[PDB]
């Protein structure tokens, strides 16, 4: 049913292959995870949490890569996901282009915010928002979220577990092993926005994360600096809500994805 192409990559998320659905030559990605390697399960039977979360968010169009099907094997699960073509991850786009023009960062950041809102509306917290987990559809100018292997159901009580990326993790996790979902998401969004307009993440060490001194290494507008600094407030309750982010003055007059592809990607 799927014709397996080359390996795209592997790591903590499993092994991901290019593929085509035989039935109609639709490009897919085929993702293998061994059961021993999975820690977070969910409710068919016990599936990995990624499957539960993907099903919660894969209905309707969105900026989330959609789960098309999945299979259990004796030692592993196999997930079939959409694959845009052609396609570059945001980490590599940034490495190759350096700091992004503000117009482009705004278009990308806006799309990520809409995707994360979608997930939260569906009851899903991603918990590993970072450039490596965002794909760009280079023709359509559309961003897509991937890798829900560290996610959870969204809740209003405290989380005391975390297996996302530490340099995107908020000070309250580093100091207390405690965070709330939305406020931790907003922190990760601050890290991401900085990454886009400066060309790399602001903090590498625990001490920098909790110190919360933001130093700008590139020329960034005052309005953009203000938004980033707000997302990166040390106190969780001082961070903006998604509405406050999207209403921020830096976020006005966003390009449409087709305009973004035409001006910046084509």
């Amino acid at each position: 049913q799927y014709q397996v192409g080359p390996l795209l990559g592997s790591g903590g998320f499993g092994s991901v292959y290019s593929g085509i659905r035989v039935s109609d030559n639709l490009p897919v990605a085929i993702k293998h995870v061994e059961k021993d390697r999975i820690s977070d399960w969910g409710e068919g039977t016990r599936v990995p949490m990624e499957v539960v979360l993907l099903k919660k968010v894969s209905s309707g169009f969105s900026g989330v890569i959609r789960l098309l099907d999945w299979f259990e094997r004796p030692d592993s699960f196999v997930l079939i996901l959409e694959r845009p073509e052609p396609v570059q991850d945001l980490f590599d786009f940034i490495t190759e282009r350096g700091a992004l023009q503000e117009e482009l960062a705004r278009s990308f950041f806006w799309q990520v915010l809409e995707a994360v809102r979608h997930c939260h509306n569906c009851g899903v917290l991603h918990r590993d928002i970072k450039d490596e987990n965002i794909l760009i559809d280079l023709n359509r100018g559309e961003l897509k979220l991937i890798d829900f292997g560290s996610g959870a159901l969204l809740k209003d009580t405290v989380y005391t577990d975390f297996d996302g990326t530490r340099v995107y993790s908020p000070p309250e996790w580093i100091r207390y092993h405690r965070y709330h979902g939305r406020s931790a998401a907003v922190w990760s969004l601050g890290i991401l926005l900085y990454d886009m307009v400066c060309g790399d993440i602001p903090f590498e060490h625990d001490e920098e994360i909790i110190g919360g001194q933001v130093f700008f290494r590139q020329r960034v507008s005052s309005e953009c600096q203000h938004l980033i600094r707000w997302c990166l407030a040390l106190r969780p309750s001082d961070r903006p809500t998604f509405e406050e982010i999207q209403n921020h003055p830096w976020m006005q007059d966003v390009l449409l994805p087709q305009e973004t592809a035409e001006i910046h990607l084509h």
Binding site: G12, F13, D128, E132, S150, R166, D200
Partner: peptide, 8 residues
């Protein structure tokens, strides 16, 4: 200077 950071 710029690198990926694996989860976990």
């Amino acid at each position: 200077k710029r690198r990926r950071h694996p989860s976990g």
